[PDB]
Amino acid sequence: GAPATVTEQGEDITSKKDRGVLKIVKRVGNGEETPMIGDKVYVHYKGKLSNGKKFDSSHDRNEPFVFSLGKGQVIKAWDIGVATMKKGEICHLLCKPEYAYGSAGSLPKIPSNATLFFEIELLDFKGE
C-alpha cells in the first residue's frame, strides 16, 4: 500500500542519512519556497501505522493542523519533512520510531517502536 511504496521508492531526507525519514512527492506544489524554521505552517494530514490502519486525520475535523516549524514541537520526522515541502505540495512520509515516538510509543494509539506513515499537504505558511 502507500506505506510500502514509500519504503521502496522514498528519498532519505535525513541530514544523518540514516533512512529515518523517507519521502515521496505525490503532488508538486505551485510554491517556489519552503517554510523557514519558526514559520507557522498549516497542513492537512492522514496518519497510518505499519498494519495500514488510520490513527489520525485532520480531514476528519475539517480544519488544518498548525504548528511552528523546526521548534521540536512535533515529532522530528515532521520538523524534517515539512521543511522540505512547497505550498500546495502533497507528500508521503515514512517515519522510523527514532524520528517519531521511539521505544515508549504513545498508547493507546502509537505502539512501542512504531514506524508511522503520513500523507501531508502543505496548505500555507506565515512568518512568526
Active site residue 56: yes
The H or E element spanning position 6 is helix 2-9
Contact set for a second copy, span 19-58 (CB under 8 A):
40, 56
109/107 Cα distance (integer angstroms): 5
Contact set for ligand RR5, span 38-67 (CB under 6 A):
38, 40, 47, 55-56, 61-63, 65-67
With binding defined as CB under 6 A, does residue 106 bind ligand RR5? yes
With binding defined as CB under 6 A, does residue 76 bind ligand RR5? no
With binding defined as CB under 8 A, does residue 66 bind a second copy? yes
Q: How many C-beta neighbours within 10 Å does residue 77 have?
A: 25
Just list the catalytic residues: 45, 55-56, 75, 101, 118
